[PDB]
RNA sequence: ACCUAUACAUUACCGCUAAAGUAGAUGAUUUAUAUUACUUGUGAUAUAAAUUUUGAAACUUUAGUGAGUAGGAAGGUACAAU
RNA sequence: AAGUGCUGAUAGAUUUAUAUGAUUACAGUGCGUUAAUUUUUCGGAAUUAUAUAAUGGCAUAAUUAUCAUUGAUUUUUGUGUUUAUUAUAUGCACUUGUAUGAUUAACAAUGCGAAAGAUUCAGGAUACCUUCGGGACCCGUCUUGAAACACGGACCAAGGAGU
C-alpha cells in the first residue's frame, strides 16, 4: 500500500540489453560475462561494425536515478528486525529485501514489523510456504 | 512608418471603389486632422522664443 | 513590367476576400480578356478520400547504413516534391493483425485483433514527393511494401 | 481486383525498350506492385542485330567447367531474357526480392485473360521517345529464334487467332456505340438531365 | 556560370621615383565578381611587368550590353591549348546577349574539342553584322523567310502518369 | 517549350513590339481564338481542373 | 485619464507609452490613497486563526514544485467563417457534412448537423479535425443565441458517487448521455430557423438535399494542391 | 534541386579535466501582526506559524571535452585467511 | 540592408532553486491635475507648453588633419537656428498577468493504487522461439602486413605462470 517515494522521477535508461562477451556464443566453456579483449587482431577490441557493443563509461546511467528500482526506491538489505529500525525514516528513499539467509521464522515479524513504518519490502511472499 | 504606408495603400483603392472609409481607414485618417492643431498651435505657440 | 507582381498575385486575397489589397479579376475564365493566373498543368490523384494510402518502403537508410528512427513512405499519388509537401505533420498510422484479444472493450467497444502503430509524418524525403515519418514504436521492416494510412487529420485546410 | 493499386498492372511489351521497361517494373515491383508483362516477343532492343547476337551469344558460353548443369542456365524466351533482366534490377538473393519476383508473371503472346483486362503503357519506356532516328533497334523476337526458341511461329498463330476474333468483338462494338448515340437521343428531354454536366465539360458536348 | 562581363582597369601603385602609373583596361568574362578580378592579373602577367602587389585593380564594373533583344550573331577570336597544341581559333554564335555567346563557345569548344576553360583565352569578341559571317552553322539562320517546320518540343516524357494509360502518338496530325 | 498552332500573320522580321501590336489585332486572333476548336478543350483548364467541393 | 495606447500585435515590437509621463505627469501634489489594512491579524480573541495543531506541524508527505502558468493565449484559427460546410475527420461523425455557426473562446467551432438533417447534434469539434470546404452558407441575421457557451457544456459529472461523499458503487454506471432536455428544446430552435436558410440557398454543391452524402471522393481531383 | 558518416551544430545524460562556493546553527531566514524608535518613512523589538546537517573523504555552481596497441598510473571487483 | 509582413511544419523542454541561500529586479495590467482638438458616439481619439546635454537637421564661427585641393573630407568644437527624434520626471496598493532562475505549461479525454479479490495504459533483443530489413570472415600469436594456402586450438570440469 506504500505510496512511491519522494514524488518519483522518470528513470530512462541507455541500454536494458546487458553485454554478451566475444565468442560467448561459440564456447560453453566461456562465460557470457563480459571481459575486455586484449588480443591484437580483435575486430572486438577494435570496434568494427556490427560485431558487438564493450561497455564503457558512456552508458552510465543517470545519477538522480542511479541505483533505483522499478518503484523508485533504492534498496537497502535487511538481515533482522532491528536492522529496520534504521529505516524508520528513510522508509522514503530506500526499500528493503529480506536476505535469503533470513529464515521463515524471523520473516513474519520482519514483514509485520514493516508493515508499521510503512516501508514496501520488495519480497514478501518469501518462505510462504502456507505450510509448516 | 509600414503602417502608413499601409494606410496610404489601402486609399489607393478610394481610387477605384471608393467604398469605405466607415469606420475603418478614414479613421485611421481623421487624426491627422486633429493632428493639423500640433501646427495650428505652432503658429500661436511656437511664438512664444 | 515585373511590377504587376507586386498587384497582380496579391489578387488572390481579393480572391480570398479580405481587406483586398488588389480587386482585380485574373479570373480564371474563358473570357479572350483573360489568360492568366498561372494553373500548373497538372496532377489528378485523389486516393485523399480519407486515410491517404501510402507503402512503406524502407527505413532512412544510407547505403550501408540504416537508421530505423525513421520511415521512408510512397504516397499515392504524389509525385513532386510540392505534392508531398502536403501530408507533413499528418498523423501517418501502420495498421496490422495479430492473434490475440487479451483485452477487454474498454474504450468505444474494443475488439482488439486489429493492431496500429501510430506515428507522424515528418519532413519530405525525395526530389519526387517521397516522404519520411517518424513513428511510436519504429515498423518491423517486414512492413516493407504494406500500406501504411496517411491520415487527413490535423488538418490546415 | 482490389489492392495498392489493381492486383495487376498489365503492360504491354510492344514497342518498348528492354531495360528501361526492366528497371521500372523491378523498382514498382519493389513498392509492393504486381506488374504482369504481355508481349514479351516485342520488346524492342537498342543498337542492330548483330549487336545483340554477339551479346547473347556471349552469355551463353559462359557455363561451369567442372560440371555445366550447375552453371549459369541460359534460358531462350523472350520473356525470360526480359525475366533475366528484373532479376539483375531485383535483391534475389533476400527473402524480401524474392517474393518482388513472385508478383511478376511474364508473358510472351498476350494469353489467358490478359487479353482482356486493360493494359497500359509505360511513355519513360516507349522506343519513339527514346531513341533517336537513323539508329537501328532490334526485338527480342528475332533473338530468341536465332538463339533456340522453338515456338516463334506457335505463338504467331495463336496471335494472329486472337487478332481475328478481336474484328468480331470490335463489330459487336463499333455498333453498339451507334445504338448509344442514337440512345443519347432520347433522353434529350429527360427532365433537366445533362445541363449539370456539360455546363463543366461541353467540349464533348 | 553564364559569364556576364566587366571592364577591369589596372594601376601599378605609384611608386615614388613615378606617380601616375598608366592606367590599363580589359574585358572580362568570368561568372562572378572576384574571378573577373582574377583573370584580369594572369592576363597582366604576359603584356605589363606590374604583379600583386605591385599593382592596384582601380574601378571595375559589370556590362550589361546594349541592345538585349537584337539578334546578332557574334564572332569570337579565339586561343586554346590542346594535349600539344596552343591553337588559334575563330568562332561564330547567334545571341542575344554578348555573355550569352561567350558561354556559348565554352560549353560547345568544351565539348568539341575536349578543351577544358582553363586553357581557353578569348582575345576579341565583337559582334559581326552578316555577309562576313563564316561558319556554315550560323549563315544558315539568315534568310528570311525562314520556313523550317521542325515539329519540335521536348516531348516530356512522359506526363504526370508513370503508368500511362494514352501511348502519345507525337506528330499529332 | 512552346507548342504551335494553326496561325501565323504577317509582320516583317525585323518588326517591334507595337507593330506586332497593331498586327495581333488588326487580323482579329482574339476572337477567334477563344472558339478554336480544341480551344474550347483548353478550357478544361477552367472548368475542369479545380472544379472545387 | 486614458491613453490606453497598447499597439502590440501586429507590429510585433511595439507598445508606446514610455512617450507618456512626460508632460502628462502633474509631477507634484502626490496624494494617494494608500490601502494599509492590518486585517490579515491573529487576533484569537475569539478568533484562532494560527492556525491551530490540525496540524501546524511536520507530517511529512512530498508531491511536486509549483506550476509556472501558462494562461490563455492567443488562439490561432484559420479561416473559417460562420457557416461554413464542414467535413469531419473523427469522432462518431466521420465523414458528415456539417455546417458550423460559432467559434468559441476555448479555440473550437460549434457545429449542428442539422441534427434534423444530417444526426449530427450541436456539437463541438476542433479546427484540427474538420476540412473547411470554399465558400459560404449566408446567415446573415441568425441570432446564434449565445448561452450556448464552451464553458456551459462539460460533462456534469463524476461526483465520485452520487454527491453523498463516501459511498459504495456497482460497475456500468449511465450517468453521462440523456441527451438534455434544454439541448433538445436548442436543438429545435436552430434547425428550424437552420433549414428555412438553407433551402433559400440556390441548390449549388451543398445547400439542400446536397449535405447529405458521407465524404469520399472521386476521380481528376484531390487531396493534395486543391483550390479546395 | 536532392540523398548521404561515429564530422559540424543546438539539447538531454555519463565520465574526465580545470576553476568557483558553503560551514558563527544557545545561528541564519521567511510570512503576518502587535507594539514601536519613529524619518515623512524604514528599521529595531515582542507574539503566532514556518523553513533551515553533508561519510566537509561531503554538498552546491560553472565551462570545456572523450581514438588507442606496446606501456604506465588511479578507482572498483571476484577468491581465501588473520 | 531594413521586420517589411507573416504564414507553415519539425524535434527537443535540466531542474529534491535550500531535500545548507533572494522567486526579485524588470517591465505589463487595474485607483488620484488639466484643457480644447478630433473621431465613434459604446469606448477611443488628439493637444501643447512640462524640465535636458540636447543627439540628428540648418546657418555661422572656429580649429586638428587630409583623397585632391574650385574643392571635398574632416577634427575640435562653439554659437545661433528651427526642423524633427529619443530618454528621464509612474509612487501606493492589486492580479491567475508576462519576463528570469539550462522559460512546458494552462484544457480535456481515457482509467478507479481499487479489503482479500482484481483490470487499464505504458514498457520489457531481460536469457531464447516466430517474422523481416541492415550490418556482419576465427580466435590467440609473431609480424610491415593475419580471415589467411602461417603456427596452437575437437569439446568440458579441476590445476596452471611475475614469487
Given at each position: ?132 | ?49 | ?157 | ?205 | ?148 517546320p521542325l515539329v519540335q518540343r521536348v516531348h516530356h516524357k512522359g506526363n504526370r502518369k508513370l503508368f500511362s494509360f494514352r501511348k502519345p502518338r507525337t506528330y499529332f496530325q | 517549350n512552346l507548342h504551335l498552332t494553326k496561325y501565323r500573320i504577317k509582320f516583317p522580321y525585323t518588326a517591334p513590339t507595337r507593330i506586332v501590336r497593331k498586327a495581333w489585332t488588326e487580323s482579329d486572333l482574339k476572337a477567334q481564338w477563344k472558339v478554336s ?17 | ?228
Open positions: 500500500m506504500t505510496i512511491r517515494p519522494a514524488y518519483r522521477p522518470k528513470i530512462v535508461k541507455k541500454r536494458t540489453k546487458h553485454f554478451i562477451r566475444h565468442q560467448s556464443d561459440r564456447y560453453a566453456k566461456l562465460s557470457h560475462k563480459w571481459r575486455k579483449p586484449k588480443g591484437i587482431d580483435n575486430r572486438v577490441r577494435r570496434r568494427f561494425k556490427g560485431q558487438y557493443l564493450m561497455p564503457n563509461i558512456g552508458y552510465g546511467s543517470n545519477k538522480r536515478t542511479r541505483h533505483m528500482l522499478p518503484t523508485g526506491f533504492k534498496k537497502f538489505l535487511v538481515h533482522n528486525v532491528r536492522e529496520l529500525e534504521v529505516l524508520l525514516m528513510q522508509n522514503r528513499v530506500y526499500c528493503g529485501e529480506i536476505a535469503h539467509g533470513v529464515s521463515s521464522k524471523k520473516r513474519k515479524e520482519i514483514v509485520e514489523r514493516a508493515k508499521q513504518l510503512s516501508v514496501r519490502l520488495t519480497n514478501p511472499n518469501g518462505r510462504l510456504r502456507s505450510q509448516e | 512608418a509600414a503602417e502608413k504606408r499601409t494606410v496610404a495603400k489601402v486609399l489607393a483603392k478610394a481610387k477605384k471603389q471608393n467604398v469605405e472609409l466607415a469606420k475603418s481607414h478614414f479613421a485611421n485618417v481623421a487624426t491627422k486632422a486633429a493632428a493639423n492643431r500640433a501646427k495650428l498651435l505652432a503658429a500661436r505657440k511656437k511664438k512664444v522664443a | 513590367m515585373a511590377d504587376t507582381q507586386a498587384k497582380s498575385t496579391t489578387a488572390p486575397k481579393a480572391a480570398k476576400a479580405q481587406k483586398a489589397p488588389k480587386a482585380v479579376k485574373a479570373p480564371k475564365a474563358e473570357k479572350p480578356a483573360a489568360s492568366e493566373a498561372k494553373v500548373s498543368a497538372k496532377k489528378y490523384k485523389r486516393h485523399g478520400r480519407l486515410f491517404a494510402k501510402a507503402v512503406f518502403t524502407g527505413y532512412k537508410r544510407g547505403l550501408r547504413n540504416q537508421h530505423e528512427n525513421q520511415a521512408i513512405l510512397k504516397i499515392e499519388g504524389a509525385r513532386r516534391k510540392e505534392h508531398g509537401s502536403f501530408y507533413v505533420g499528418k498523423r501517418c498510422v501502420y495498421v496490422y493483425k495479430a492473434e490475440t484479444k487479451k483485452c477487454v472493450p474498454q474504450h468505444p467497444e474494443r475488439k482488439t485483433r486489429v493492431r496500429a502503430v501510430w506515428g507522424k509524418v515528418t519532413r519530405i524525403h525525395g526530389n519526387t514527393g517521397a516522404v519520411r515519418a517518424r513513428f511510436n514504436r519504429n515498423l518491423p521492416g517486414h512492413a516493407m511494401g504494406h500500406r501504411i494510412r496517411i491520415m487527413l487529420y490535423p488538418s490546415r485546410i | 481486383m482490389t489492392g495498392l493499386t489493381n492486383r495487376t498492372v498489365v503492360i504491354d511489351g510492344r514497342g518498348h525498350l528492354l531495360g528501361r521497361l526492366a528497371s521500372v517494373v523491378a523498382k514498382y515491383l519493389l513498392q509492393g506492385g504486381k506488374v504482369a508483362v504481355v508481349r514479351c516477343e516485342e520488346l524492342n532492343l537498342s543498337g542492330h542485330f548483330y549487336r545483340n547476337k554477339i551479346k547473347f551469344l556471349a552469355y551463353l558460353r559462359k557455363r561451369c567447367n567442372v560440371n555445366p548443369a550447375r552453371g549459369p542456365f541460359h534460358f531462350r524466351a523472350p520473356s525470360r531474357i526480359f525475366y533475366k533482366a528484373v532479376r539483375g534490377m531485383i535483391p534475389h538473393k533476400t527473402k524480401r526480392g524474392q517474393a518482388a519476383l513472385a508478383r511478376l508473371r511474364v508473358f510472351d503472346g498476350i494469353p489467358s485473360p490478359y487479353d482482356k483486362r486493360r493494359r497500359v503503357v509505360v511513355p519513360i519506356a516507349m522506343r519513339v521517345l527514346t531513341l533517336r532516328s537513323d539508329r537501328k533497334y532490334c526485338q527480342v523476337g528475332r533473338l530468341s529464334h536465332e538463339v533456340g526458341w522453338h515456338y516463334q511461329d506457335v505463338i504467331k498463330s495463336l496471335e494472329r487467332k486472337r487478332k481475328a476474333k478481336l474484328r468480331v468483338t470490335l463489330k459487336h462494338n463499333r455498333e453498339l456505340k451507334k445504338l448509344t448515340v442514337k440512345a443519347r437521343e432520347n433522353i434529350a428531354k429527360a427532365a433537366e438531365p445533362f445541363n449539370k454536366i456539360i455546363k463543366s465539360y461541353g467540349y464533348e458536348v | 556560370g553564364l559569364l556576364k562581363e566587366y571592364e577591369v582597369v589596372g594601376r601599378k601603385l605609384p611608386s615614388e621615383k613615378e606617380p601616375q602609373t598608366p592606367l590599363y583596361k580589359m574585358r572580362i568574362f568570368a561568372p562572378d565578381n572576384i574571378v573577373a578580378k582574377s583573370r584580369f592579373w594572369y592576363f597582366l602577367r604576359q603584356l605589363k611587368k606590374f604583379k600583386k602587389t605591385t599593382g592596384e585593380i582601380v574601378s571595375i564594373k559589370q556590362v550589361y550590353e546594349t541592345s538585349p533583344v537584337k539578334i546578332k550573331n557574334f564572332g569570337i577570336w579565339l586561343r586554346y591549348d590542346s594535349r600539344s597544341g596552343t591553337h588559334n581559333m575563330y568562332r561564330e554564335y547567334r545571341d542575344l546577349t554578348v555573355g550569352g555567346a561567350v558561354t556559348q563557345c565554352y560549353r560547345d569548344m568544351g565539348a568539341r574539342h575536349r578543351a577544358r576553360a582553363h586553357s581557353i583565352q578569348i582575345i576579341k569578341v565583337d559582334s559581326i553584322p552578316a555577309a562576313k559571317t563564316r561558319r556554315v552553322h550560323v549563315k544558315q539562320f539568315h534568310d528570311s523567310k525562314i520556313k523550317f | 476548336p480544341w480551344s474550347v478543350k483548353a478550357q478544361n483548364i477552367c472548368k475542369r481542373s479545380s472544379l472545387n467541393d | 485619464k486614458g491613453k490606453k495606447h497598447p499597439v502590440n500585435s501586429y507590429l510585433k515590437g511595439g507598445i508606446l507609452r514610455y512617450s507618456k509621463a512626460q508632460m502628462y505627469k502633474r509631477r507634484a501634489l502626490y496624494r494617494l490613497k494608500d490601502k494599509k489594512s492590518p486585517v490579515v491579524e491573529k487576533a484569537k480573541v475569539p478568533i484562532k486563526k494560527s492556525k491551530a495543531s490540525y496540524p501546524t506541524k511536520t507530517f511529512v508527505k512530498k508531491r511536486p514544485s509549483k506550476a509556472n502558468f501558462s494562461e490563455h493565449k492567443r488562439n490561432t484559427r484559420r479561416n473559417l467563417t460562420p457557416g461554413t460546410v464542414l467535413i469531419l475527420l473523427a469522432g462518431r461523425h466521420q465523414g458528415k457534412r456539417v455546417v458550423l455557426l460559432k467559434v468559441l473562446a476555448s479555440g473550437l467551432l460549434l457545429v449542428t448537423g442539422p441534427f434534423a438533417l444530417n444526426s449530427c447534434p450541436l456539437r463541438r469539434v476542433s479546427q484540427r479535425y474538420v476540412i473547411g470546404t470554399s465558400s459560404k452558407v449566408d446567415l446573415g441575421a441568425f441570432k446564434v443565441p449565445e448561452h450556448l457557451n464552451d464553458a456551459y457544456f462539460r460533462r456534469l459529472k463524476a461526483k465520485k458517487d452520487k454527491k453523498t461523499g463516501e459511498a459504495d458503487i456497482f460497475a456500468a454506471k449511465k450517468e453521462r448521455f440523456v441527451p438534455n432536455e434544454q439541448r433538445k428544446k436548442d436543438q429545435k430552435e436552430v434547425d428550424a430557423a437552420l433549414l428555412k436558410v438553407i433551402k433559400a440557398h440556390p441548390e449549388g454543391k451543398f445547400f439542400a438535399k446536397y449535405l447529405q452524402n458521407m465524404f469520399a471522393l472521386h476521380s481528376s481531383q484531390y487531396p493534395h494542391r486543391m483550390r479546395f
